[PDB]
Curated annotation (Swiss-Prot):
Protein name: Motility hub protein FimV
Record function comment: Inner membrane hub protein that plays both cAMP-dependent and cAMP-independent roles in twitching motility. Regulates intracellular cyclic AMP (cAMP) levels through the activation of adenylate cyclase CyaB. Plays an essential role in a number of virulence mechanisms including type IV pilus (T4P)-mediated assembly and twitching motility as well as cAMP-dependent virulence gene expression. Also mediates type II secretion (T2S) of lipases and proteases. In addition, mediates the cAMP-independent localization of multiple T4P structural and regulatory components to the cell poles.
Compartments reported by the entry: Cell inner membrane
Disrupted gene: phenotype observed: Mutants are incapable of twitching motility. In addition, loss of FimV dramatically reduces the levels of the PilQ secretin multimer through which pili exit the cell.
Disulfide bond positions: none
Note on domains (UniProt): The N-terminal domain binds peptidoglycans through LysM motif. In addition, this motif is required for PilQ stability and multimerization. The cytoplasmic domain contains three discontinuous tetratricopeptide repeat (TPR) motifs involved in protein-protein interactions.
Assembly and interaction partners: Interacts with FimL. Interacts with DgcP.
Whole-protein residues included: 862 to 919 of 919
């Protein structure tokens, strides 16, 4: 069953890191930034670091 199919905080941050990259590829830096900010709050230390890297490319 799919009764318990839900994603695990880090899996969500991982997805969001990739979504953020897609927004960047598309030139929507505002859309990328909003998603990256979620990673800052949600991701582990590595994902937070990566999100910070991506945020710096936007500046």
């Amino acid at each position: 069953t799919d009764d318990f199919d839900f994603l695990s905080g880090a899996d969500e941050a991982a997805t969001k890191l990739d979504l953020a990259r897609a927004y960047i590829d598309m030139g929507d830096s505002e859309g990328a930034r909003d998603i990256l900010d979620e990673v800052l709050a949600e991701g582990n230390d590595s994902q937070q670091a990566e999100a910070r890297e991506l945020l710096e490319r936007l500046a």
